[PDB]
Write a protein that binds this ligand. Structure first.
Ligand SMILES: *[C@@H]1O[C@H](CO)[C@@H](O[C@@H]2O[C@H](CO)[C@@H](O[C@@H]3O[C@H](CO)[C@@H](O)[C@H](O)[C@@H]3O)[C@H](O)[C@H]2NC(C)=O)[C@H](O)[C@H]1NC(C)=O
Ligand SMILES: *[C@@H]1O[C@H](CO)[C@@H](O[C@@H]2O[C@H](CO)[C@@H](O)[C@H](O)[C@H]2NC(C)=O)[C@H](O)[C@H]1NC(C)=O
Ligand SMILES: *[C@@H]1O[C@H](CO)[C@@H](O[C@@H]2O[C@H](CO)[C@@H](O)[C@H](O)[C@H]2NC(C)=O)[C@H](O)[C@H]1NC(C)=O
Ligand SMILES: *[C@@H]1O[C@H](CO)[C@@H](O)[C@H](O)[C@H]1NC(C)=O
Ligand SMILES: *[C@@H]1O[C@H](CO)[C@@H](O)[C@H](O)[C@H]1NC(C)=O
Ligand SMILES: *[C@@H]1O[C@H](CO)[C@@H](O)[C@H](O)[C@H]1NC(C)=O
Lengths: 193, 265, 242, 49
């Protein structure tokens, strides 16, 4: 805390949870029809039959194998929790962002204690030790050093915000095509049909 | 601010330091008591306005401070915006973003107009004044799911939407000699000792310049040949006159194109 | 009209609808195109992302030319006075200071321009993809060429950018029905070929999935697969044979 | 501060760039998550096949 402030997000975590719940409810109760107009209700097995038609498999495969498919789906969801919890280095990409931000802030707050070719990193010591003539030179040196530090920080932040924007655009496209509908693109919404 | 602490120093230590450099703690040389040093509260003094064309009332949002402190420091004189405070009373609200003075917290909820922070937005409503509220995410619509219920449409609507996208930016070029050493024969000789910064600046600018033309060529020149519509006749009933060229005015554009060209400056 | 019949067939709706509602569809399209002009004209802050580019470039140039008046901790901000006021050594010192400051200004400007050029290049590639997929063809990607099922897209030029008019299909006026995955007639299950089974309370029909058009159930609309003991929600009606 | 005043308008651009990043973050979140018009509620959580 030396002039650096962190601002809160506009959308709180509960609101994002409520969007996620709304999207899930629309998917499970209406199908793919709530992203392209008013939502229309449809039973879940019929929706899954429509999706099998979409991947090129007839309807008979689903209705004559309903229990087996339901069991496989339930087992997969069950194993997802264990797979995520067992591996510690699973959510590494998100941790990289916070770690890089912390490193940048810490480097910035550390560079206040570098003499930068001056007598001392404490300005009060500089002022109450010598005359205004040399004080001008020392203060100018410190000002140039800290201005360069700030410029570096801001440029790095912009470069990283560019990448985060690209990832956000990709996530939006995935939400619009993978969640609000069915994708024929290969290796986009998973490894498989 | 020097508050009481509970750190257990060792008998030979004087100060204390945090993870970076800062003097978090200190020990008084006389009474030999640990004292925690916490920095003075500071932040932004952001301003909320509905529009000078509409009104003149404002609200002020202090970021990341306990309304209590502000008020305390409002009393006496400790703050440094020096605004004599934008009007007090039953108008000091404490939100997760900070301390808001000039608006009243209602219990209603509708679409956000001016974001403030956390769930808190502000607007100008009805006499009429600035109010602050918690954002509403939209209505609640429970779909009638059932084991044997389906819904089928019986009519359709043809809709036309608009999307806008940038394609190019202005091409600029800069000359070092005129910028830095303006019309001076005694400054140029002192620039040759700083190396070859100028050649790479010019290279970067030229690269941006050629990329600007590559962008337009890639976006627009997707047709090998130029096609022309016939003497415009019955397209089945669809009009199309608002998007096709109009051969009755210079620059041969179309009415929507003319409106677009007459609104961007 | 044949082109739009093909467009309709590409979103799941048969060709009967367009040829039987041509007049209504043409009127709807004309009214939408009419409203577009007023919607663009009335709202001032519509072409905003296009204005931001011009404003940012102007601000960059203005700050660059404003920093030429900065003194950067020198005697003054003009070379002529610094030259014709003092000795060559201190002149060298002051000129060195000013040169360093102005090089810093140029470096900042060029880096900012590079970053903004990268962003605009990304936007331009997106625009090219939209032109190739929504104007030269029909896109099945959801919410890529407009809200709703896609029919057409028309381009328009604009200062430093493009405006796409997306023409899309939105269903409306829904109605509730009772469904059933299959129907058993003579001990064997029948499944639909292209539609869903509905019933208004008394009789059963087979319909499409995006526009109500009931049809009687016949052997040329349904296909048979297996007996009737394995499916869950199977009703028992008749499948006529023409 | 008086000496810093002579260095020009570095500060206004630094602040503008930081605010640009700040608003961009909220825009990104809104684009990713606010894709639905109305909030949909699940029924009494029941047999989904
Ligand atoms: C859609 O189909 C499901 C079939 O699974 C229906 O749910 C079932 O409804 C019956 C009552 O109608 C439930 O039976 C009750 O079970 C409890 C068990 O403790 C028992 O104490 C009661 O006396 C009664 O027998 C049954 O459990 C329930 N099954 C599930 C998994 O929900 C559902 O009602 C149908 N929905 C519609 C549209 O009616
Ligand atoms: C296509 O739509 C435009 C917009 O309404 C029509 O233009 C108007 O047509 C009437 C009748 O000719 C004229 O009196 C108006 O002055 C026109 N207004 C404009 C915008 O110029 C146009 O006629 C329609 N095309 C067809 C073939 O009906
Ligand atoms: C469901 O739709 C069918 C459509 O065939 C209706 O059947 C006809 O309804 C009219 C009503 O005036 C009768 O005059 C006809 O004789 C009926 N024909 C058949 C096929 O029986 C049926 O009445 C509708 N039922 C409900 C509950 O709406
Ligand atoms: C602010 O001060 C009050 C006074 O005790 C305290 O209750 C509250 O927790 C503090 N924090 C905030 C920001 O509400
Ligand atoms: C469909 O909508 C149009 C326009 O609202 C209306 O004129 C027409 O009568 C409607 N048709 C039906 C079947 O309701
Ligand atoms: C149809 O279903 C009823 C009730 O399950 C049953 O009694 C009957 O034998 C079935 N067969 C047909 C096609 O009538």
């Amino acid at each position: 805390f030396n002039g650096l402030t962190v601002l809160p997000p506009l959308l709180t975590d509960e609101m994002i949870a409520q969007y996620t719940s709304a999207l899930l409810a629309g998917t499970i109760t209406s199908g793919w029809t709530f992203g392209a107009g008013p939502a229309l209700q449809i039973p879940f097995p019929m929706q899954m039959a429509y999706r099998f038609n979409g991947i090129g498999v007839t309807q008979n495969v689903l209705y004559e194998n309903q229990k087996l498919i339901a069991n496989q789906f339930n087992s997969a969801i069950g194993k997802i929790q264990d797979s995520l919890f067992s591996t510690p280095s699973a959510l590494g990409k998100l941790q990289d962002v916070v770690n890089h931000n912390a490193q940048a802030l810490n480097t910035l707050v550390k560079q206040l204690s570098s003499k930068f070719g001056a007598i001392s990193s404490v300005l009060n010591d500089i002022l109450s030790r010598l005359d205004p003539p040399e004080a001008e030179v020392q203060i100018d040196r410190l000002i140039t050093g800290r201005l360069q530090s700030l410029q570096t920080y801001v440029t790095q932040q912009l470069i990283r915000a560019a990448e985060i924007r690209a990832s956000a655009n990709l996530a939006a496209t995935k939400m619009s095509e993978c969640v609000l509908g069915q994708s024929k693109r290969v290796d986009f919404c998973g490894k498989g049909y | 601010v020097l508050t009481k602490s509970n750190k257990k120093f060792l008998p030979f230590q004087q100060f204390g330091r945090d993870i970076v450099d800062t003097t978090d703690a200190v020990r008084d040389p006389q009474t030999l008591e640990i004292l925690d040093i916490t920095p003075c509260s500071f932040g932004g003094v952001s301003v909320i306005t509905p529009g000078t064309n509409t009104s003149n009332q404002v609200a002020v949002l202090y970021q990341g401070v306990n309304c209590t402190e502000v008020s305390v420091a409002i009393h006496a004189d400790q703050l440094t915006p020096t605004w004599r405070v934008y009007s007090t009373g039953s108008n000091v609200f404490q939100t997760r973003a900070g301390c808001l003075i000039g608006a009243e917290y209602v219990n209603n909820s509708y679409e956000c107009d001016i974001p403030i922070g956390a769930g808190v937005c502000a607007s100008y409503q009805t006499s009429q004044s600035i109010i602050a509220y918690t954002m509403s995410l939209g209505a609640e619509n429970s779909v009638a799911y059932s084991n044997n219920s389906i819904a089928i449409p019986t009519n359709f609507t043809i809709s036309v939407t608009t999307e806008i996208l940038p394609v190019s930016m202005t091409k600029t070029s800069v000359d070092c000699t005129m910028y830095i050493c303006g019309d001076s024969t005694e400054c140029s000789n002192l620039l040759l000792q700083y190396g070859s910064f100028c050649t790479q600046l010019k290279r970067a600018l030229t690269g941006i310049a050629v990329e600007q033309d590559k962008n337009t060529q890639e976006v627009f020149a997707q047709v090998k040949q130029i096609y022309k519509t016939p003497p415009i006749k019955y397209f089945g009933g669809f009009n199309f006159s608002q998007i096709l060229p109009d051969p009755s005015k210079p620059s041969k554009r179309s009415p929507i194109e003319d409106l677009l060209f007459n609104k961007v400056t | 009209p044949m082109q739009m019949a093909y467009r309709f067939n590409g979103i799941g709706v048969t060709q009967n609808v367009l040829y039987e509602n041509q007049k209504l569809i043409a009127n709807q399209f004309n009214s939408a195109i009419g409203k577009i002009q007023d919607s663009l004209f009335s709202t001032p802050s519509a072409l905003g992302k296009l204005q931001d580019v011009v404003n940012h470039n102007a601000q960059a140039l203005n700050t660059l030319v404003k920093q030429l008046s900065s003194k950067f901790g020198a005697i003054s901000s003009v070379l002529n006075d610094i030259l014709s006021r003092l000795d060559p050594p201190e002149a060298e010192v002051q000129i060195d200071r000013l040169i360093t400051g102005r090089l810093q200004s140029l470096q900042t400007y060029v880096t900012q321009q590079l970053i903004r050029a990268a962003e605009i290049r990304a936007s331009a590639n997106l625009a090219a993809t939209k032109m190739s997929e929504c104007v030269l063809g029909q896109s099945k990607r959801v919410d890529f060429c407009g809200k709703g099922y896609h029919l057409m897209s028309f381009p328009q030029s604009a200062p430093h950018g493009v405006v796409f008019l997306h023409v899309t299909y939105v269903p409306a006026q829904e109605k509730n029905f009772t469904t059933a995955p299959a129907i058993c007639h003579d001990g064997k299950a029948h499944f639909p070929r292209e539609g869903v089974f509905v019933s208004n309370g008394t009789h059963w029909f087979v319909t499409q999935r995006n526009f109500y058009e009931p049809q009687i159930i016949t052997t040329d609309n349904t296909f048979v697969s297996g007996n009737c003991d394995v499916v869950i929600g199977i009703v028992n009606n008749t499948v006529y044979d023409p």
